[PDB]
Amino acid sequence: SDAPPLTLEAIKDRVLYVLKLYDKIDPEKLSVNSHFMKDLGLDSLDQVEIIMAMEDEFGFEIPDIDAEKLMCPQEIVDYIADKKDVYE
Amino acid sequence: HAFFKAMLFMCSGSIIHSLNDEQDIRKMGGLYKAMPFTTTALIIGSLALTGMPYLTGFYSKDLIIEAVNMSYTNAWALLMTLIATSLTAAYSTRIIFFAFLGKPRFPPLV
Amino acid sequence: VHIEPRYRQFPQLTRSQLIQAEFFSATMWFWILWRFWHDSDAVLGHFPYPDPSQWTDEELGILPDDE
Amino acid sequence: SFPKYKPSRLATLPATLDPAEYDISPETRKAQAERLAIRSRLKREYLLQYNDPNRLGVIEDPALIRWTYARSANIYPNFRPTPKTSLLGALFGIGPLFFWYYVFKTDRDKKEKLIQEGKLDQTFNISY
Amino acid sequence: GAHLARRYLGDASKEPDPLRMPTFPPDYGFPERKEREMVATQQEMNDAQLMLQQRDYCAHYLIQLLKCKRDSFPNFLACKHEQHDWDYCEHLDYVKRMKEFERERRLLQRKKRREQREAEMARG
Amino acid sequence: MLKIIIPTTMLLPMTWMSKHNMIWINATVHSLLISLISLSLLNQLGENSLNFSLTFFSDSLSAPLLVLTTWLLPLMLMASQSHLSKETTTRKKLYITMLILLQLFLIMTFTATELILFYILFEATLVPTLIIITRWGNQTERLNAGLYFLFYTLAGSLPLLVALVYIQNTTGSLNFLIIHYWSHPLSNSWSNIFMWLACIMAFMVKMPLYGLHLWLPKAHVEAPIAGSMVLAAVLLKLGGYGMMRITTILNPLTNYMAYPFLMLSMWGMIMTSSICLRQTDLKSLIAYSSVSHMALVIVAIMIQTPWSFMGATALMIAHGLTSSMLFCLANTNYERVHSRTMILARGLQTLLPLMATWWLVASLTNLALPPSINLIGELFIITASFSWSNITIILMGMNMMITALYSLYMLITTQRGKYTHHINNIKPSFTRENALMALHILPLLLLTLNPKMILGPLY
Amino acid sequence: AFSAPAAYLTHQQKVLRLYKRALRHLESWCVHRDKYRYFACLMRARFDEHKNEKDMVKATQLLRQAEEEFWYGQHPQPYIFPESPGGTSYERYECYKVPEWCLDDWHPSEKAMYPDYFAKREQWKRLRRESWEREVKQLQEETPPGGPRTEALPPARKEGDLPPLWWHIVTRPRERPM
Amino acid sequence: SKMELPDYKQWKIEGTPLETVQEKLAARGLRDPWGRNEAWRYSGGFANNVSFVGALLKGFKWGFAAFVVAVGAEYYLESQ
Amino acid sequence: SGYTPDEKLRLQQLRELRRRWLKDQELSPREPVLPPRHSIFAVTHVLIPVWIIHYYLKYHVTAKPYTVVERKPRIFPGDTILETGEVIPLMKEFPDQH
């Protein structure tokens, strides 16, 4: 058997886990609607690093044209779910 | 050579299937303990490939090298054969070192 | 047998695979040691290699530079 | 700093190494704008009929028809005898023929002369 | 290897040529040479179908080893004395070949020394 | 042999008096029966021919060609009855009449025992083919294709008629048997040189020779599928039959008059084979492959050795079957998408798997995969050429590699990759198309089971 | 892939792309995690050094020198994700992707199985048929008389509407269709 | 099934080469904000690994023990 | 700088539609409505083929000359030929130099 059918809850949990292991983000201040630029005060390079971290975690690469405009954890989980045809 | 080369490829396929269809050794961490049977089979195959004494590769490869050393042949061909014999152990070490020793480099979902 | 993913933990192993891998590695090493004990000459050689520079001029059949 | 990269025909120049992208003038910017406009209007024209529920068949691509016509039937009407075309036609059409004729004639002359003079190792040459 | 080093770096005319050998007659320095003895006749080697390269002066031991192999089939380890005897005969043959090479080498040595000495005598 | 000739002349009124909805059924059934009857000509003797009468005869070279013709007519009917559905009954009967007349003319041509009758029927084959192409073709290039075909043929064939009447006046007869038994050497003269050219050039054009081949792509591309099948399978082999019949009187001039043509056939073999690598049209690719195979056959006939003749016969039969199958396969896609461009409809293996395996088997046969009869013929010709000159192997091997290259290139382009997104009118393959493919391909393998039946009289 | 591109990339966009590429190739060079972390922080500092510069000309010049250095130092064999456009599994599953319209060609005996699926498919087809004309009208309203300037599409602006040109996006085969 | 992820606070970079990296970076006034994301590769069962030569001699102990036993058996078989 | 409101809205609507379509791709429990010895393998896949091949080789192939040609068996000094019954002499007094 191959990998189990990854669901929405797993994606959200793992994205928030990776973001909570980031030393530039306060874990209790971070939510799933938290904007990276406003609600956390990070700059463009930090967003690039977060995108690469999620790429490394989920085993697939998000192109630069699509990745540059993901500024919330909900946006990231939505993009990952749409890429993998996660509907539940 | 059929024996150990075929089983080396089968070990590589086991590794690839286990690590979510990953083939690059730069993302294969510590599988010496995570895959004990695969690592023992790959070690035995790499030792047979390099001509470790009294293995299947021994009885053919050492005899071939001895016959090459004891023949009226090209000097350059002899030297190239010896250097290739060294590089065989070189790349076997490459595979074992980069795939089975060290720390994990694969995605967290194991 | 059913084994679950663990997410950053060492994978769950089985006693069967461990004992099988250990048994086969031990079998290989025992075979190597036993064969080297019985058939060492296949590695170290069996017959002595003579030195030509030690041979006497008589058994090679050469006169002492007389004719 | 570092040794340079020399492009060629079969290994072209990368975009990030091309100075034409690091010196931008407003004319180039509006040229890029109109290029994107043409591409977008073509994409819209394709997508309007691609997603049509009532369409059944092959969406005709005028570019493909133009390409095939230009590569097949438009060549001779646009051909003109010139020194380049004349010399190239003569060379590539006659030179190989004369070269192979000379090679085969020489080989068979040698073989026939050897046969008449009396040694070619013809033993067991039954099937011919 | 050292012989290759001497031949390709030193006086090549002073070292034996492996292809053109022997240069000297077989009785140049031997008062009495005994012909080499062959134990197995042509018909025996033909019937054993040994090989066109295994029919050397050691073919009798090879025939014995093949017979022992065929006779004790299921036990493939039962032919060790015959194998050792064939290996020892081949080893002795190789020793004789090395002896021939060395003899030709020092015969060329002596020939060159004698020629240079005779030329030196001619200088007076 | 009238037991085969008369049933076709009876196919004519049966077709013209059948009711409107049973023309195809009757034509197919009775054509298949006629092919079964013609199968009895394969029992050939070992020394001489089968001299039925004063006018007709058969040997082991014309029998496989007759069987191929009789077998090809039903395939042509099955492939034609799809694109003529909207046609009126009268013009459908006219089309079937054209096909029947073509088969009858070919049957008499392959067995005519004297050269003037053979010429008359060999030229009579032109009229039904021209009518088919220029009346039932699809594009506006069919008129030019017909003109090129007709005039290319006649320009080379009229001097053949002049030379034939000259030969009959000089020697007294044109019967093949009397011609062979009373044969005399041709002297090295300018008159003999031009007689050789007149006797050879018609069949050169019909192959076609490289340089005189420009009619073939036009004619085979603009024609309907039945026209393409009859052109590629049978009508190209008339040149080979005529060449191997008329070369018996051209010796020993051939020994030095074949030198130009051989070159044109060898180097041309490469050139046409390279053209297929850059063809954007599938039918043109198949036509150019036919040109290269026919060049190989021309080499085989020109070097004039028994192995070369056996290889030429085998290659003629094998190419007929393979090219017919390839044209039918391409036509299926054409009826799907109404375009001949190769890169239009891609990734068809996903949507048409059984048609994909038909494509694969046809391509494998085309590139001479052993032990097919294609490979047998090509290999016998190659061995004969190597005996002729050991330097020929370079050109032959180059041709083999390029042939494999373009065959698998066409297969990969049409069948593999991903489907074109907007093309949504690809319906499942019909029983008729699959049956047509199977009836093309099964005789090929059954023939490699027993190859001596297509190896010619030199066997 | 899902985003409509612009006519050009801004200087910030180019800098970010070069940063990501340099980090990826550096990770390819430094296979071990700690070494990669050390040299990645060094690279981050090297990028941060010139982020405050105001002169745009020297900024783009430094970007050009950065580009030249990257080409020289790039990994010959950078790590590629398996499903990436250079990876070992890039188009592995394209042979299993079958368009949905193929189901219209099924035999009635084939459609006899999966009756509920074909009922839902008929629902979807009816929805598409009823929404097509509204989609076309909405697309006609919003574009300039000179044609669209970019390939970005608008959403549905009414409660009962659907986003125009949606059928082929929504009915993609799958990522692993078999 | 339905596995749940471990606590994220258990991942400490202390006791790993990530400590050495962090110290060498702080010596230059630089920070590594992703060390905790990599700590799982060093903490659990991946804490220690064998060397190359140690990997080669994976089953040497049992093989040598069996070798000694068999040699002793065949040596004392010579008491006929 | 992130999605524009129109981009976000279109993505959300397309995402809802796509998830609905994927949900509809599932199968109801009855969807595949299907319309209405211990050692046999060795007998059928080994015994029968070997019977056929043995018959074809023993009674058809070997009926013709030279179709089956075996290498001549090796003869060593000391063996006795089954048909002739003769004994090959021993191999000439080995010097026995060990």
Ligand SMILES: CCCCCCCCCCCCCCCCC[C@@H](O)O[C@H](CO[C@H](O)CCCCCCCCCCCCCCC)COP(=O)(O)OCC[N+](C)(C)C
């Ligand atoms: C597109 C492709 C179409 C097909 C092409 C077919 C090619 C046909 C050519 C046939 C080759 C042979 C023709 C002539 C035979 C001899 C060759 C020539 O060199 O003659 C020499 C003689 O020297 C001169 O060449 C004489 C001929 C000079 C005039 C011919 C030149 C024509 C130019 C080529 C035109 C291209 C052909 C297409 C025309 C439309 C030989 O010297 P010699 O041994 O003493 O004479 C032998 C013949 N004898 C015994 C009967 C007298």
Ligand SMILES: CCCCCCCC/C=C\CCCCCCCC(=O)O[C@H](COC(=O)CCCCCCC/C=C/CCCCCCCC)COP(=O)(O)OCCN
């Ligand atoms: C698709 C285009 C194909 C073109 C093919 C057409 C050309 C074919 C070759 C020329 C054919 C003409 C041959 C004429 C008929 C042959 C009969 C014959 O050989 O009899 C000779 C007669 O020989 C001739 O008279 C031949 C004259 C040729 C005149 C026609 C010229 C045609 C063009 C010539 C050059 C081109 C030929 C090759 C072109 C190849 C195509 C590219 C002997 O007659 P006597 O007078 O009795 O002599 C013996 C006693 N003294």
Ligand SMILES: *OP(=O)(O)OCC(C)(C)[C@@H](O)C(=O)NCCC(=O)NCCSC(=O)CCCCCCCCCCC
């Ligand atoms: O929007 P933000 O996220 O805030 O982006 C900030 C930004 C940098 C865009 C902004 O401050 C800005 O516009 N700065 C202008 C100057 C500038 O950034 N110039 C580019 C600096 S290039 C440079 O020096 C990088 C050095 C490393 C280059 C790679 C060499 C090594 C490659 C080999 C790989 C193994």
